[PDB]
């Protein structure tokens, strides 16, 4: 069989010399903090997974339901914090940056735990649970309010059987800019939407110049993110995958380190 190396010594040879390290992170990193991701092993919200609710069409049809889901997700972050994987990554960035070596995190996650852990060079390619965008005027705003709007207070219960709140659109979250009052939506990239062109340019720049790439906690089923680390590997650059399981991309990489990132990464990035 054709399986990548699990030699930490061999990895460390590349790590010691890298001037430009790209770390791609996914839902497995957030899962280690207890964040429910609602895909793969990450559970269900009522009857649904993220693929069912995080879509333009779900939000067209039942914007109260989609906002209930995102509200639940916002509110549970109250009890979720960065883990040893987040900290290994942030500390590595800090330590390497003092030596003039660059570390950039490209994250699929929307829960801002890499920000909270102190990562500075962060590309949030799918947006943020704590940002809104207006469906009419297009302005993006940071929003941490708990609850986001009065009508959502105590709604979002995840239990199967929980009935739709059916909040009238006028009482869901609304633009507060002079003269808009649009419906807001979460500033999150949904299935079926494209990624911001500006961010993808920044991503391609990092991938084209990096000399080592880590893919951490990624199922490597969500595109286009899942295509980033294979592209690096095809330039001959070493790519190490850190994940609890093998994925469809595993055999494209030079290393696979099995386990929770919070166990493997502090060792790898030391």
């Amino acid at each position: 069989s054709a399986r990548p190396s699990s030699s930490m010594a061999d990895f460390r040879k590349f790590f010691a010399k890298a001037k430009h390290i790209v770390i791609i992170s996914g839902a497995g990193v957030s899962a280690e903090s207890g964040v429910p991701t609602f895909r793969g092993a990450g559970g269900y919200w009522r009857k649904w997974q993220a693929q069912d609710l995080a879509t333009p069409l779900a939000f067209a049809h039942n914007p109260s339901r989609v906002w209930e889901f995102y509200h639940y997700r916002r509110e549970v972050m109250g009890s979720k914090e960065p883990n040893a994987g987040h900290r290994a990554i942030a500390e590595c960035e800090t330590r390497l940056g003092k030596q003039g070596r660059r570390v950039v995190v490209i994250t699929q996650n929307i829960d801002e735990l890499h920000r909270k852990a102190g990562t500075k060079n962060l590309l949030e390619i799918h947006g943020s649970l704590f940002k809104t965008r207006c469906t009419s005027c297009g302005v993006v705003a940071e929003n941490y309010k708990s609850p986001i709007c009065p009508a959502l207070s105590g709604k979002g219960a995840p239990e199967p059987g929980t009935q739709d709140a059916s909040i009238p659109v006028e009482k869901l979250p609304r633009c507060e800019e002079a003269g808009c009052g649009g419906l807001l939506r979460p500033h999150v990239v949904w299935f079926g939407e494209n990624l911001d062109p500006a961010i993808l340019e920044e991503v391609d720049r990092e991938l084209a110049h990096c000399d080592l790439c880590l893919v951490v906690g990624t199922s490597s089923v969500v595109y286009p993110a899942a295509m980033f680390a294979p592209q690096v590997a095809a330039r001959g650059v070493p790519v190490a995958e850190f994940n609890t399981e093998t994925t469809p991309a595993t055999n494209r990489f030079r290393f696979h380190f099995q386990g929770p990132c919070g166990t493997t990464l502090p060792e790898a990035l030391a």
Binding site: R39, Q51, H126, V189, W190, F191, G192, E193, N194, L195, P197, L200, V221, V222, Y223, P224, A226, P248
Partner: peptide, 7 residues
């Protein structure tokens, strides 16, 4: 555009 999906 460059579009989001899951396999």
């Amino acid at each position: 555009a460059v579009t989001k999906y899951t396999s």
